């Protein structure tokens, strides 16, 4: 329970840390590009050197295309992690396409939150 | 290998660690822990716990089809659920600052922040940071040391 001693430093997993993408875009606006560098630096400082990147699309489109879309999104994020020190092999890339939503696609808001890469840290 | 007994108490300890790296924006006086759905190793937590920081953990078992889970629980330890159930529960929580942790570690692509791997010589977990970022609770990155501290012999 050593986590209680933690003051205000290094809390880089807040609401801002979401990795979202514009409609049909697979490349990181420099806002998120930075968000990622922060994150990737944050992971390295705690001796984690390996993650899995899972890309998703929203609803619009045929699955095949969105699958391919999602994978690209993931790989765009992977490059940042590469440029931040993480061995590329230690960076698994997966594309889940429109199959696994986190939000209501019946809503514009939701759809934005669905076009995301999700950083998972494996044990 | 190990015993269900032992492993239960282990889930207790690894949970309690994770809590220490988490911050509720409006920190309650008693942490409310909801065990939801089928569980193998929540017997320990169901006995109740107390944090290192004074706060007691009040833990009850709760029903998958309860809508108000999000206001009833600060900490949800999620049991075995199919995809539909899992969706319902996370609609229950959507919005409210609620930490979330699974007993099994196969379901970590959407949903819980932490997913446990409990069989085997040490307890670990996978962490989903989108899930974390979405949570609405503040979780510090150094918590990730709890998963590899035991994945290292
Ligand atoms: N440890 C602790 N920190 C608190 C508590 N209440 C507020 N804070 C502070 O609230 C701040 C978080 O601000 P925020 O994330 O909303 O921008 C941190 O400075 C955090 O330490 C509390 O009850 N305990």
- Breaks in chain A (C to N over 2.5 Å), named by the residue before each, are none
Cα nearest neighbour of A17 on chain B: B133
| Resolution (Å units) | 3.0
Closest CA to A47 of B146, B101, B94, B41: B146
Which of B21, B105, B133 lies closest to A3 in CB terms?
Answer: B21
Burial A41-77 (b: 16+ CB within 10 A, else e): ebbeebebebbbbbbbbbeebeeeebbbbbbbbbbbb
State the number of CA atoms in the 13 A half-sphere of A33 facing the CB.
Answer: 8
> Angle, nearest 10°, between helix axes A63-83 and A30-44?
60
Paired tokens of B33 = 């822990």
Tell me the residue range of the domain where A103 lies. 1-123
Q: How far is CA B69 from CA B22, B73, B90, in A?
A: 19, 6, 9
Distance between CA atoms of B123 and B77, rounded to whole angstroms? 15
Chain B residues close to A42, C-beta within 8 Å: 141
Experimental method: X-ray
Paired tokens of B14 = 């690894």
Would you call A71 helix, strand, or coil by DSSP? helix
Residues flagged as binding site of B: 23, 138, 140
Inter-chain contact B52–A6, Cβ cutoff 8 Å? Answer: no
Q: How far is the CA of B86 from the centre of ligand 1 (A)?
A: 30
A83 CB contacts (<8 Å, ≥6 apart)? A37
Contact B20 CB / ligand 1 (< 6 Å): no
Q: Whose CA is nearest to atom 19 of ligand 1?
A: A8
What is the CA B139 to chain-centroid distance, rounded? 13
Mutate to test the pocket of ligand 1, among B23, B29, B53, B137 (most ligand atoms within 8 A of CB): B23
Closest CA to B31 of B122, B147, B137: B137
CB pairs under 8 A between A and B: 105
Q: Which atom of ligand 1 is nearest to the CA of A6?
A: 1
Paired tokens of B118 = 């409990």
A65 CB contacts (<8 Å, ≥6 apart)? none
The full 3-state SS of B58-123, as one line of letters, equals EEEEECCCCCCHHHHCCEEEECCCCHHHHHHHHHHHCCCCCEEEECCCCCCCCCCCEEEECCCCCC
* CATH number of the domain within which A117 lies: 3.30.1330.60
For the beta carbon of residue B91, count every other beta carbon within 10 angstroms.
Answer: 13
Inter-chain contact A120–B109, Cβ cutoff 8 Å? Answer: yes
3-state helix, strand, coil in chain A (%, to 5): 45, 15, 40
- In angstroms, what separates the C-alpha of B17 from chain A's closest C-alpha? 4
Q: Where are the beta strands (DSSP E) in A1-123?
A: 19-20, 51-56, 91-97, 116-121
For the beta carbon of residue B90, count every other beta carbon within 10 angstroms.
Answer: 22
Concatenated DSSP letters for B3-59? -HHHHHHHHHHHHHHHHHTEE-TT--SSEEEEEES--SS-HHHHT-EE-TTS-EEEE
Closest CA to B2 of B118, B85, B138: B118
Q: How far is the CA of B47 from the centre of ligand 1 (A)?
A: 29
Cα nearest neighbour of A6 on chain B: B21
Closest CA to A104 of A65, A59, A55: A59
What's the structural domain count of chain A? 1
For the beta carbon of residue A95, count every other beta carbon within 10 angstroms.
Answer: 21
In chain B, domain spans: 1-153
């Amino acid at each position: 329970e050593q986590g209680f001693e933690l003051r205000d430093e290094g809390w880089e997993f807040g609401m801002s840390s979401k990795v979202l993408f514009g409609n049909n875009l697979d490349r990181l606006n420099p806002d998120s590009r930075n968000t990622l560098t922060k994150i990737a630096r944050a992971l390295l400082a705690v001796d984690i050197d390996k993650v899995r990147l899972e890309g998703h699309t929203d609803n619009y489109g045929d699955e095949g295309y969105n699958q391919k879309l999602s994978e690209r999104r993931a790989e765009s994020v992977a490059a940042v992690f590469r440029e931040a020190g993480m061995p590329a092999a230690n960076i698994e890339v997966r594309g889940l396409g429109m199959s696994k939503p986190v939000a209501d696609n019946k809503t514009r808001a939701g759809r934005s939150e669905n076009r995301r890469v999700a950083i998972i840290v494996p044990a | 290998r190990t015993s269900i007994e032992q492993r239960s108490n282990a889930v207790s300890q690894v949970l309690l660690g994770i809590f220490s790296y988490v911050r509720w924006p409006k920190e309650p006086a008693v942490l409310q822990l909801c065990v939801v759905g089928p569980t193998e190793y929540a017997d320990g937590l169901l006995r109740g716990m107390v944090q290192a920081n004074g706060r007691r953990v009040h833990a009850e078992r709760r029903a998958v089809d309860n809508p108000d889970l999000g206001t009833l629980c600060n900490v949800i330890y999620l049991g075995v659920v199919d995809e539909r159930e899992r969706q319902q529960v996370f609609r229950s929580l959507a919005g409210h600052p609620v930490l979330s942790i699974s007993e099994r570690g196969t379901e970590c692509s959407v949903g819980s922040m932490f997913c446990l791997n409990v069989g085997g010589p040490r307890i670990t977990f996978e962490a989903n940071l989108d899930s974390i970022a979405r949570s609405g609770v503040r979780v510090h990155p150094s918590v990730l040391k709890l998963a590899r501290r035991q994945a290292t012999p």
